[PDB]
Design a protein around this ligand. Structure first.
Ligand SMILES: *[C@@H]1O[C@H](CO)[C@@H](O)[C@H](O)[C@H]1NC(C)=O
Ligand SMILES: *[C@@H]1O[C@H](CO)[C@@H](O)[C@H](O)[C@H]1NC(C)=O
Ligand SMILES: *[C@@H]1O[C@H](CO)[C@@H](O)[C@H](O)[C@H]1NC(C)=O
Ligand SMILES: *[C@@H]1O[C@H](CO)[C@@H](O)[C@H](O)[C@H]1NC(C)=O
Ligand SMILES: *[C@@H]1O[C@H](CO)[C@@H](O)[C@H](O)[C@H]1NC(C)=O
Ligand SMILES: [Zn+2]
Lengths: 595, 194
């Protein structure tokens, strides 16, 4: 009879059986990542085979209801997530090869080799080819390096992408959707909650407007790098033109990080870095992970359970065991929290521990909530909470109190300007790249871009938005959107644009609450209780509330604001006015090495 | 002249579940409650209506002992006036309870690599419980309007769920042993006291 009774009882059975099997899967992965043996990796298969198989029926056995006969808001959201079937609602025979094409694409990307002239010996991307990608300043070798990768792998994947788009586009029409691009846009959609409505169509509105106010910063940043890059390559960069696409410190040009040596303003005043001073007082791995608490304990955030200190790996194994050394924060569930990292004694490792510790605190705050609503508010919230912590752990005031810096240390403005440019090359020079990649990918999925104009349309927006040109044009043989990790394994990329605008909104309120005066780039939130208790409001809601409500409580604006990202770089913006007055602003798209 | 009978209720190789708990009647004995502070008065010793000190010399007609194993966060429901899965369907206490509730940690005994699947509790029941009563029932729950014919399936769930207990859990899902002592006073000679 009543839908409320059976719907409420079904989730009680699901919310408890899920915990038993979810914990089994997570621990099986932890054992494999610490013990790589043939027998141990075998045990993983069953752990993931009794969760993927288990989730299928509960998706079918929760679709036999109807949404409009539920009046509770909290209870209704748990059903909506569980009703998503994917391709399982379609026939098994027309969607059997859709899996086969997808995993085939990733196999080719993994197996890729770029040789060298005379074929003296072979090279591979990890780590050999990446090592010499932009470590040298040989233009002719740079040209070989770029087109070599584009020719080898970009040619093979072109047939295997049109079939990928066409076959899977109809899958979106099976789940009641317009285009596949809107399916990826459904993580920022909330309905039936007054004054807190967000639509898929709206996510194109704010992103276009939020980038409209970032261009003035990017406009002047391009001029500075172009002016100083002329010294290394004086024959191939005109005073007024777009940057070449193979002088950027990456195979794809995502992060402008490997350019500090060629673009350092002051070469007489070193940037602050303490690795030897830490290497003086017989510093060990445990001490690094203990001072991480004092940042969190002295801000009123909780301690960590004793299970953190015995079951977790906080150092290299030191034995014949083979493990993966990439840092990761794990949430095995049911009160078990662990951290895995190959810790060494360096300044860069000091800040990484602060980042990884921020993830654990977010998990420790919403464990009370149901299983299906135990995650961040949206895609880019987990990597925004854990990035502001490294911002208060690299300030030259916090380190002074920690005793790792001399009490008498003057803060010259040259170091401040030198420090700000390093951050701009990482978190400011990648925003147009992500927007351009996603805007093309949304349009190519919609169907507005025709068959013959795929790759021409790729470079039409490249000149206008980011401002790079290809040395040698290609017609229909090279797929540039095939050389990336995310694009070739069916992942999203808009999580990397929101988390960069979201962190600076969080940082501008946790500092104003803490009563800090001055510029924001020397802000320490340590010893503040009012600020440290405001963060415990968003962090405990999880996915119970819409992402609009979570942001409303912390900053005071229900939308995305870009002004905080322009107050973190305000001293930098003043400097570029004087150092770019005797130069040209903007870039011309018509200029190209065609002949 | 005789040792206290606090040797099987408080010291057992294996305990019982909560859906089918254990009751022991203790009477006609010289029992000293000072030993209760020597084994495990660790997590909680709360009681109401009887002072935990200077009232051990009073005489009562009967003493009741109940023992079971529940979760760490579920010990807050063993009290008059609380609600929850344990309090409303497994074990309910009267509004004017007379006795002390003792809880302590037992991780080293009720934890296994695969988990102790021998501990079970009842998840949903048709109606709430009356105080001081127990139910050991294996009958399907009719969540719908269709007869189940005694076989589970759609809208037909097994009413008892397990307690997976592993040593790597937190201090919230760790196994705990709770012994509830009930003091009764009635119209009869109070033989049991010390
Ligand atoms: C890891 O594997 C080795 C042998 O491969 C074994 O001796 C050791 O006990 C294992 N350690 C753990 C924690 O499983
Ligand atoms: C919605 O569910 C919650 C569950 O905690 C309950 O307390 C509340 O009364 C429900 N709302 C309505 C209108 O029934
Ligand atoms: C630490 O620095 C002091 C500075 O004088 C030095 O004397 C001492 O030897 C250093 N300790 C080391 C290098 O272990
Ligand atoms: C940095 O040094 C002092 C700071 O008080 C100031 O006079 C000077 O103009 C600043 N800028 C430069 C480029 O020296
Ligand atoms: C301020 O921080 C320092 C270093 O963490 C600490 O020793 C001191 O007690 C703090 N003061 C207050 C008032 O919290
Ligand atoms: Zn879901």
């Amino acid at each position: 009879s009543t839908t409320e009774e059976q719907a409420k009882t079904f989730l009680e059975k699901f919310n408890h059986e899920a915990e038993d099997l979810s914990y089994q899967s997570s621990l099986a992965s932890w054992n494999y990542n610490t013990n790589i043996t043939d027998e141990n990796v075998q045990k993983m298969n069953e752990a993931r085979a009794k969760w993927s198989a288990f989730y299928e029926e509960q998706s079918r056995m929760a679709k036999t209801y109807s949404l409009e006969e539920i009046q509770n808001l909290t209870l209704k959201r748990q059903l909506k997530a569980l009703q998503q079937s994917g391709t399982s609602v379609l026939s098994a025979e027309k969607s059997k090869r859709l899996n086969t094409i997808l995993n085939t694409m990733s196999t080719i990307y993994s197996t890729g080799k770029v040789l060298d002239p005379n074929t003296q010996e072979c090279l591979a991307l990890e780590p050999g080819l990446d090592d010499i990608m932009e470590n040298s300043r040989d233009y002719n070798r740079r040209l070989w390096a770029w087109e070599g990768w584009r020719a080898e792998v970009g040619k093979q994947l072109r047939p295997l992408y049109e079939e990928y788009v066409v076959l899977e586009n109809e899958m979106a029409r099976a789940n009641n959707y317009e285009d596949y691009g809107d399916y990826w846009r459904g993580d920022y959609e909330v309905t039936e909650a007054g004054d807190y409505d967000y639509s898929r169509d709206q996510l194109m509105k704010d992103v276009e407007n939020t980038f409209a106010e970032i261009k003035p910063l990017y406009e002047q940043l391009h001029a500075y790098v172009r002016a100083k890059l002329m010294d290394t390559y004086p024959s191939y960069i005109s005073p007024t033109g777009c940057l070449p696409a193979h002088l950027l410190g990456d195979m794809w040009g995502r992060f402008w990080t490997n350019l500090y040596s060629l673009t350092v303003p002051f070469k007489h005043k070193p940037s602050i870095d303490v690795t030897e001073k830490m290497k003086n007082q017989s510093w060990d791995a445990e001490r690094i992970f203990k001072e991480a608490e004092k940042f969190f304990v002295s801000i009123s955030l909780p301690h960590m359970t004793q299970g953190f200190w015995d079951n977790s790996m906080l150092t290299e194994p030191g034995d014949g065991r083979k493990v993966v050394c990439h840092p990761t924060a794990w949430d095995l569930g049911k009160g078990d929290f662990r951290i895995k990292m190959c810790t060494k004694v360096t300044m860069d490792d000091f800040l990484t521990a602060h980042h990884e510790m921020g993830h654990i605190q977010y998990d420790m705050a919403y464990a009370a909530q149901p299983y299906l609503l135990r995650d961040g508010a949206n895609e880019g919230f987990h990597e925004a909470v854990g990035e502001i912590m490294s911002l208060s752990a690299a300030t030259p005031h916090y380190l002074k109190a920690l005793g790792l810096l001399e009490p008498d240390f003057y803060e010259d403005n040259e170091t401040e300007i030198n420090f700000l440019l390093k951050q701009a090359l990482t978190i400011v020079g990648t925003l147009p790249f992500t927007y351009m990649l996603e805007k093309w990918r949304w349009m190519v999925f919609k169907g507005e871009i025709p068959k013959e104009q795929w790759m021409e349309k790729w470079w039409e927006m490249k000149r206008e938005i980011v401002g790079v040109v290809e040395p040698l044009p290609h017609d229909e043989t090279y797929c540039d959107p095939a050389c990336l990790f995310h694009v070739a394994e069916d992942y999203s990329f808009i999580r990397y644009y929101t988390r960069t605008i979201y962190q600076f909104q969080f940082h501008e309120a946790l500092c104003k609450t803490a009563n800090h005066e001055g510029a924001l780039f020397k802000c320490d939130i340590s010893n503040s209780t009012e600020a440290g208790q405001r963060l415990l409001q968003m962090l405990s809601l999880g996915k119970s509330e819409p992402w609009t409500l979570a942001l409303e409580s912390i900053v005071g604006i229900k939308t995305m604001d870009v002004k905080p990202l322009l107050n973190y770089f305000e001293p930098l913006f003043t400097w570029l006015k004087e150092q770019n007055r005797n130069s040209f602003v903007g870039w011309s798209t018509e200029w190209t090495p065609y002949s | 002249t005789n040792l206290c009978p606090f040797d099987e209720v408080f010291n057992a190789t294996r305990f019982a579940s909560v859906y089918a708990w254990n009751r022991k009647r203790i009477s006609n004995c010289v029992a000293d409650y000072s030993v209760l502070y020597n084994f495990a008065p660790f997590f909680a010793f709360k009681c109401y209506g009887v002072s935990p000190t200077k009232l051990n010399d009073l005489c009562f007609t009967n003493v009741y002992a109940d023992s079971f194993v529940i979760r760490g966060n579920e010990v807050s429901q063993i009290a008059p006036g609380q609600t929850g899965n344990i309090a409303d369907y497994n074990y309910k206490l009267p509004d004017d309870f007379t006795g002390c509730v003792i809880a302590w940690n037992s991780n080293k005994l009720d934890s296994k690599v695969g988990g102790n699947y021998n501990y079970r509790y009842r998840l949903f029941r048709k109606s709430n419980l009356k105080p001081f009563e127990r139910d050991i029932s294996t009958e399907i729950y009719q969540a719908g309007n269709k007869p189940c014919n005694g076989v589970a399936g759609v809208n037909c769930y097994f009413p008892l769920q397990s307690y997976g207990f592993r040593p790597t859990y937190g201090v919230g899902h760790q196994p705990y042993r709770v012994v509830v002592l009930s003091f009764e006073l009635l119209h009869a000679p109070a033989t049991v006291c010390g």
